[PDB]
Amino acid sequence: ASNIVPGATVIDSTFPKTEGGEGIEGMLNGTITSLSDKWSSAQLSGSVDIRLTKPRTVVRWVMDHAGAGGESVNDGLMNTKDFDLYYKDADGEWKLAKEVRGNKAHVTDITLDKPITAQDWRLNVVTSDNGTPWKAIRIYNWKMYEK
């Protein structure tokens, strides 16, 4: 209802185009149905550009990492560590909304410094985990909220 990511389209990414289990769309649907309701990639870093169903004024940004979906629940070794959110401004320029460094938590729930109005948003995964033996990008949901 209030998460405004679901229905978003992928407009660009820096990952080889590839069918198709646990694709990018997995983190857009806002659900944790099962192990298959995430995005996972063997490429340990990269970015995703999405276009929301409409422009939104975003105040809050939530990421459900692997631990939130029941993977490595005890230690969080599979949880995304460094990752940033960018937005495309009115002039068409990408601007940094929020940088995260050193995360280990299952869920990151971040209020933005200020409300940001944009339709196109970018997630950049810098460091995909916290030293799990089975390294991968594993993101259950990318969620954002208006006031």
Contact footprint for Ca ion (CB under 5 A)? 29, 37, 140-141
CB of 29 to Ca ion, least distance (A): 5
Q: Residue 47 contacts by C-beta under 8 Å, 6 or more apart in sequence?
A: 13, 14, 122, 123, 124, 125
In the complex, residue closest to Ca ion by CB: 37
Q: Which CB, 56 or 65, lies closer to Ca ion?
A: 65
CB of 37 to Ca ion, least distance (A): 4
For the chain, helix (H) and strand (E) counts, in that order, are 0, 7
DSSP state of 134: S
CB of 36 to Ca ion, least distance (A): 9
Residue among 65, 37, 54 nearest 123 (CA): 65
Tokens describing residue 108? 């990151």
Please report the sign of the dihedral spanned by the C-alpha atoms of residue 90, residue 63, residue 126, residue 115: positive
Longest dimension (CA), the chain: 45
Q: Which CB, 22 or 120, lies closer to Ca ion?
A: 22
CB of 25 to Ca ion, least distance (A): 9
CB of 28 to Ca ion, least distance (A): 7
Q: Which CB, 37 or 82, lies closer to Ca ion?
A: 37
Residue 37 to residue 46: CA distance in whole angstroms: 20
Q: Which CB, 15 or 142, lies closer to Ca ion?
A: 142
Q: Which CB, 103 or 141, lies closer to Ca ion?
A: 141
